[PDB]
């Protein structure tokens, strides 16, 4: 649950992402894959990537980064009223991709890391607080659907 002022911070930060969605999406996935190499094994189309240089050179990884952040941005713009947008993603990630909630924690922290890396000194403590709360809400509502499905 976020206040109006917190949502305003989230959507202000998101403007930074929308200026370069592919570059942000690429770096988020690279941070996930290099920090948590077990996550790469869930992607049949990226498991061939052995080095970060190959990851950086992969145009399909940048494409998928655009898909991921476009979906997340659509959810964030609903300011919590995201049941219709979130349900299909919860279902596909639990039942088809088999993504444990832990990996959603990993990618949430990766987003925070990338924002500081690309905007050092321009991602203030209030903005980090609000973005963190928004990603916690996203993860918590996914977790509720995971529990319904019995997925661990
Ligand atoms: C912010 C969190 C995430 C968002 C918004 C997101 C979004 C998406 C979307 C929109 C798709 C394509 C449609 C679909 O299959 O539902 C997708 C596919 C997929 N996601 Fe995610 N995802 C997220 C996190 C993760 C994480 C953490 C993992 C694994 C560590 C993951 C694994 C996958 C896989 C394996 C696919 C299929 C890729 C393919 O072969 O095309 N997702 N995701």
CSV table of C-alpha atoms and ligand atoms in Angstrom, one decimal:
chain,number,residue,atom,x,y,z
A,1,UNK,CA,0.0,0.0,0.0
A,2,UNK,CA,1.5,3.3,-1.2
A,3,UNK,CA,0.4,6.9,-0.7
A,4,UNK,CA,-0.3,9.3,-3.5
A,5,UNK,CA,3.1,10.9,-2.9
A,6,UNK,CA,4.9,7.6,-3.0
A,7,UNK,CA,3.2,6.7,-6.3
A,8,UNK,CA,4.3,10.1,-7.7
A,9,UNK,CA,7.9,9.2,-6.8
A,10,UNK,CA,7.6,5.8,-8.4
A,11,UNK,CA,6.3,7.3,-11.7
A,12,UNK,CA,8.9,10.0,-11.6
A,13,UNK,CA,11.7,7.4,-11.3
A,14,UNK,CA,10.0,5.4,-14.1
A,15,UNK,CA,10.5,8.3,-16.4
A,16,UNK,CA,14.2,7.7,-16.2
A,17,UNK,CA,13.6,4.1,-17.3
A,18,UNK,CA,11.3,5.1,-20.2
A,19,UNK,CA,14.0,7.3,-21.7
A,20,UNK,CA,16.1,4.2,-22.4
A,21,UNK,CA,14.0,1.2,-21.8
A,22,UNK,CA,16.2,-1.2,-23.7
A,23,UNK,CA,19.4,-0.1,-21.9
A,24,UNK,CA,17.8,-0.3,-18.5
A,25,UNK,CA,16.2,-3.7,-19.4
A,26,UNK,CA,19.5,-5.1,-20.7
A,27,UNK,CA,21.4,-4.0,-17.5
A,28,UNK,CA,18.7,-5.4,-15.2
A,29,UNK,CA,18.9,-8.9,-16.8
A,30,UNK,CA,22.7,-8.8,-16.9
A,31,UNK,CA,22.7,-7.9,-13.2
A,32,UNK,CA,20.3,-10.8,-12.5
A,33,UNK,CA,22.3,-13.4,-14.6
A,34,UNK,CA,25.7,-12.4,-13.3
A,35,UNK,CA,24.7,-12.1,-9.7
A,36,UNK,CA,22.6,-15.2,-9.6
A,37,UNK,CA,23.7,-17.6,-12.4
A,38,UNK,CA,21.0,-20.1,-11.5
A,39,UNK,CA,18.5,-17.7,-13.0
A,40,UNK,CA,20.1,-18.0,-16.4
A,41,UNK,CA,19.2,-21.7,-16.5
A,42,UNK,CA,15.5,-20.8,-16.6
A,43,UNK,CA,15.9,-19.2,-20.0
A,44,UNK,CA,16.4,-21.7,-22.8
A,45,UNK,CA,17.2,-18.9,-25.1
A,46,UNK,CA,19.9,-17.3,-22.9
A,47,UNK,CA,21.6,-20.4,-21.4
A,48,UNK,CA,24.1,-20.4,-24.2
A,49,UNK,CA,25.6,-17.1,-22.9
A,50,UNK,CA,28.8,-17.9,-21.0
A,51,UNK,CA,30.4,-14.5,-20.6
A,52,UNK,CA,29.0,-11.1,-19.7
A,53,UNK,CA,30.5,-9.8,-23.0
A,54,UNK,CA,28.3,-12.2,-24.9
A,55,UNK,CA,25.4,-11.0,-22.7
A,56,UNK,CA,26.2,-7.4,-23.6
A,57,UNK,CA,26.4,-8.2,-27.3
A,58,UNK,CA,23.1,-10.1,-27.4
A,59,UNK,CA,20.4,-8.2,-29.2
A,60,UNK,CA,17.8,-10.7,-28.2
A,61,UNK,CA,18.6,-10.2,-24.5
A,62,UNK,CA,18.1,-6.5,-25.0
A,63,UNK,CA,14.8,-7.3,-26.7
A,64,UNK,CA,13.6,-9.4,-23.8
A,65,UNK,CA,14.7,-6.7,-21.4
A,66,UNK,CA,12.3,-4.3,-23.3
A,67,UNK,CA,9.5,-6.9,-22.9
A,68,UNK,CA,10.1,-7.3,-19.2
A,69,UNK,CA,10.3,-3.6,-18.3
A,70,UNK,CA,7.3,-2.7,-20.6
A,71,UNK,CA,5.2,-5.2,-18.7
A,72,UNK,CA,6.4,-3.9,-15.3
A,73,UNK,CA,5.9,-0.3,-16.3
A,74,UNK,CA,2.3,-1.1,-17.3
A,75,UNK,CA,1.7,-2.6,-13.9
A,76,UNK,CA,3.3,0.3,-12.0
A,77,UNK,CA,1.2,2.9,-13.9
A,78,UNK,CA,-1.9,1.2,-12.4
A,79,UNK,CA,-0.9,2.4,-8.9
A,80,UNK,CA,-1.8,-0.9,-7.3
A,81,UNK,CA,-5.0,-1.6,-9.2
A,82,UNK,CA,-3.2,-4.2,-11.3
A,83,UNK,CA,-5.1,-7.5,-10.8
A,84,UNK,CA,-5.9,-7.9,-14.5
A,85,UNK,CA,-2.3,-7.1,-15.6
A,86,UNK,CA,-0.6,-9.2,-12.8
A,87,UNK,CA,-2.7,-12.4,-13.0
A,88,UNK,CA,-1.4,-13.7,-16.4
A,89,UNK,CA,2.2,-13.0,-15.4
A,90,UNK,CA,1.8,-14.8,-12.1
A,91,UNK,CA,0.3,-17.7,-13.9
A,92,UNK,CA,2.9,-17.9,-16.7
A,93,UNK,CA,5.8,-17.6,-14.3
A,94,UNK,CA,4.4,-20.2,-11.9
A,95,UNK,CA,3.1,-22.7,-14.3
A,96,UNK,CA,5.1,-22.4,-17.5
A,97,UNK,CA,8.4,-20.9,-16.6
A,98,UNK,CA,8.5,-22.2,-13.0
A,99,UNK,CA,10.1,-19.1,-11.5
A,100,UNK,CA,10.4,-19.3,-7.6
A,101,UNK,CA,9.4,-16.1,-5.8
A,102,UNK,CA,13.0,-15.8,-4.6
A,103,UNK,CA,14.0,-14.9,-8.2
A,104,UNK,CA,11.5,-12.1,-8.2
A,105,UNK,CA,13.2,-10.8,-5.1
A,106,UNK,CA,16.5,-11.0,-6.9
A,107,UNK,CA,15.2,-9.0,-9.9
A,108,UNK,CA,13.6,-6.4,-7.6
A,109,UNK,CA,17.0,-5.7,-5.9
A,110,UNK,CA,18.6,-5.7,-9.4
A,111,UNK,CA,16.3,-2.9,-10.5
A,112,UNK,CA,17.4,-0.8,-7.5
A,113,UNK,CA,21.1,-1.6,-8.2
A,114,UNK,CA,20.8,-0.5,-11.9
A,115,UNK,CA,19.0,2.7,-11.0
A,116,UNK,CA,21.8,3.8,-8.7
A,117,UNK,CA,24.4,2.6,-11.3
A,118,UNK,CA,22.9,4.6,-14.2
A,119,UNK,CA,21.7,7.6,-12.2
A,120,UNK,CA,24.3,8.0,-9.3
A,121,UNK,CA,23.3,10.9,-7.0
A,122,UNK,CA,20.0,11.2,-8.9
A,123,UNK,CA,18.1,8.3,-7.1
A,124,UNK,CA,17.4,9.8,-3.8
A,125,UNK,CA,16.4,8.1,-0.5
A,126,UNK,CA,12.7,8.9,-0.9
A,127,UNK,CA,12.7,7.6,-4.4
A,128,UNK,CA,14.4,4.4,-3.4
A,129,UNK,CA,11.9,4.0,-0.6
A,130,UNK,CA,8.9,4.4,-2.9
A,131,UNK,CA,10.3,2.1,-5.6
A,132,UNK,CA,11.2,-0.6,-3.1
A,133,UNK,CA,7.6,-0.5,-1.7
A,134,UNK,CA,6.2,-0.7,-5.2
A,135,UNK,CA,8.3,-3.8,-6.1
A,136,UNK,CA,7.3,-5.3,-2.7
A,137,UNK,CA,3.7,-4.9,-3.5
A,138,UNK,CA,4.2,-6.4,-7.0
A,139,UNK,CA,6.0,-9.4,-5.4
A,140,UNK,CA,3.5,-9.8,-2.7
A,141,UNK,CA,0.5,-10.0,-5.0
A,142,UNK,CA,2.4,-12.5,-7.2
A,143,UNK,CA,3.1,-14.5,-4.0
A,144,UNK,CA,-0.6,-14.6,-3.2
A,145,UNK,CA,-1.3,-16.2,-6.6
A,146,UNK,CA,1.6,-18.6,-6.2
A,147,UNK,CA,0.1,-19.8,-2.9
A,148,UNK,CA,-3.3,-20.3,-4.6
A,149,UNK,CA,-1.5,-22.5,-7.1
A,150,UNK,CA,0.6,-24.3,-4.6
A,151,UNK,CA,3.7,-23.3,-6.4
A,152,UNK,CA,7.1,-23.2,-4.6
B,1,LIG,C1,9.8,-7.8,-12.9
B,1,LIG,C2,9.6,-9.1,-13.0
B,1,LIG,C3,9.2,-9.8,-14.3
B,1,LIG,C4,8.4,-9.4,-15.3
B,1,LIG,C5,7.6,-8.1,-15.4
B,1,LIG,C6,8.4,-10.4,-16.3
B,1,LIG,C7,7.8,-10.4,-17.5
B,1,LIG,C8,7.8,-11.3,-18.5
B,1,LIG,C9,7.0,-11.3,-19.7
B,1,LIG,C10,6.1,-10.1,-20.1
B,1,LIG,C11,7.3,-12.4,-20.4
B,1,LIG,C12,6.7,-12.8,-21.7
B,1,LIG,C13,5.2,-13.3,-21.5
B,1,LIG,C14,5.1,-14.4,-20.6
B,1,LIG,O1,5.6,-15.5,-20.8
B,1,LIG,O2,4.3,-14.3,-19.6
B,1,LIG,C15,8.2,-13.2,-19.6
B,1,LIG,C16,8.8,-14.4,-20.0
B,1,LIG,C17,9.7,-15.1,-19.2
B,1,LIG,N1,10.1,-14.8,-18.0
B,1,LIG,FE1,9.7,-13.1,-17.0
B,1,LIG,N2,9.3,-11.5,-15.9
B,1,LIG,C18,9.8,-11.1,-14.7
B,1,LIG,C19,10.7,-11.8,-13.9
B,1,LIG,C20,11.2,-13.0,-14.3
B,1,LIG,C21,12.3,-13.7,-13.6
B,1,LIG,C22,13.0,-13.3,-12.3
B,1,LIG,C23,12.6,-14.8,-14.3
B,1,LIG,C24,13.6,-16.0,-14.1
B,1,LIG,C25,14.7,-15.9,-13.3
B,1,LIG,C26,11.7,-14.9,-15.5
B,1,LIG,C27,11.6,-15.9,-16.4
B,1,LIG,C28,11.0,-15.8,-17.6
B,1,LIG,C29,11.1,-16.7,-18.7
B,1,LIG,C30,12.0,-18.0,-18.7
B,1,LIG,C31,10.3,-16.3,-19.7
B,1,LIG,C32,10.1,-17.0,-21.1
B,1,LIG,C33,11.3,-16.4,-22.0
B,1,LIG,C34,11.2,-17.0,-23.4
B,1,LIG,O3,11.7,-18.1,-23.6
B,1,LIG,O4,10.7,-16.2,-24.3
B,1,LIG,N3,10.9,-13.7,-15.4
B,1,LIG,N4,8.5,-12.5,-18.5
